[PDB]
Amino acid sequence: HMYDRWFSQQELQVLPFAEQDEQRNQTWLELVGEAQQLMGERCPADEPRAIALATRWMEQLEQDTAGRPEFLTRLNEMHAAEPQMREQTGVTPEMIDFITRAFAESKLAIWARYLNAEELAFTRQHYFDRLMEWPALVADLHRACREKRDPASPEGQQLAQRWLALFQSYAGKDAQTQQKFRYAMEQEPHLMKGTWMTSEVLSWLQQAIGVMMRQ
Numbered sequence: 001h002m003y004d005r006w007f008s009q010q011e012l013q014v015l016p017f018a019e020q021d022e023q024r025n026q027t028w029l030e031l032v033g034e035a036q037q038l039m040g041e042r043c044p045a046d047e048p049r050a051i052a053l054a055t056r057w058m059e060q061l062e063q064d065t066a067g068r069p070e071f072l073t074r075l076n077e078m079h080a081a082e083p084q085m086r087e088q089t090g091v092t093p094e095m096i097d098f099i100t101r102a103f104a105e106s107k108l109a110i111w112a113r114y115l116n117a118e119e120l121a122f123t124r125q126h127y128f129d130r131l132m133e134w135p136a137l138v139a140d141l142h143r144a145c146r147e148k149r150d151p152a153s154p155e156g157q158q159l160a161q162r163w164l165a166l167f168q169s170y171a172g173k174d175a176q177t178q179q180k181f182r183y184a185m186e187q188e189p190h191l192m193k194g195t196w197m198t199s200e201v202l203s204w205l206q207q208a209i210g211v212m213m214r215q
């Protein structure tokens with residue numbers, strides 16, 4: 001069976017997808033069907049119904065990957081190389097592209113209340129520049145936070161430096177603009193959806209960042 005080709009026996013017991021729960025399958029049946037309908041209509045990704053659908057997708061996908069970023073990246077490996085993936089899930093790379101942009105717009109809608117028009121335009125473009133590098137970083141942050149790596153060590157500062165590079169990629173290099181983004185996240189729970197980040201890993205990261213920013 002399909003997940004057994006990609007997950008160890010121990011991983012399979014903590015992977016919700018591997019349950020073939022009937023209710024979970026029906027939920028994804030509806031999520032896929034709704035995405036198919038919006039795509040076939042060429043629905044713009046910033047329409048409310050698209051943003052709402054993408055928000056549901058990310059909520060469900062985080063739950064069904066057990067909140068483990070490494071399980072998310074395993075699914076991405078399957079979308080690239082598992083022949084049965086479309087047949088078994090109904091999810092396609094084109095569909096994922098639509099959800100990705102609608103989920104981006106779900107965050108741009110919130111950032112619009114904190115940024116001016118020129119900052120919003122910059123981020124609407126550059127949000128996508130390095131977006132797909134975040135799951136690898138999140139996995140490396142989970143491992144670091146797990147092993148109580150010193151946030152101030154060279155290995156911790158390399159992680160903070162990788163965060164800054166991905167953050168400045170979407171936010172820009174302006175200090176006042178960056179502070180708007182950091183304030184918005186503190187104020188808006190939706191901005192940390194679709195991240196696989198936990199309060200524990202965020203604390204570890206924000207300690208590493210704080211060391212980087214004061215120095």
Ligand SMILES: COc1c(NC(=O)c2ccc(NC(=O)c3ccc(NC(=O)[C@H](CC#N)NC(=O)c4ccc(NC(=O)/C(C)=C/c5ccc(O)cc5)cc4)cc3)c(OC)c2O)ccc(C(=O)O)c1O
Binds near residue numbers: 192
């Ligand atoms: C806000 O910024 C910050 C931060 N920020 C962050 O830490 C931060 C962290 C991470 C992130 N991002 C991510 O991790 C991230 C980025 C990209 C992705 N993408 C993917 O994985 C890609 C594409 C995209 N996209 N694949 C998918 O989506 C994907 C979609 C669906 C499936 N589905 C299936 O296989 C199914 C359903 C099977 C099935 C089965 C059975 C069935 O019956 C039917 C179906 C599989 C994969 C996902 C997550 C982020 O966002 C950029 C952040 O901002 C931190 C601190 C501060 C501060 O201020 O201190 C701050 O400001």
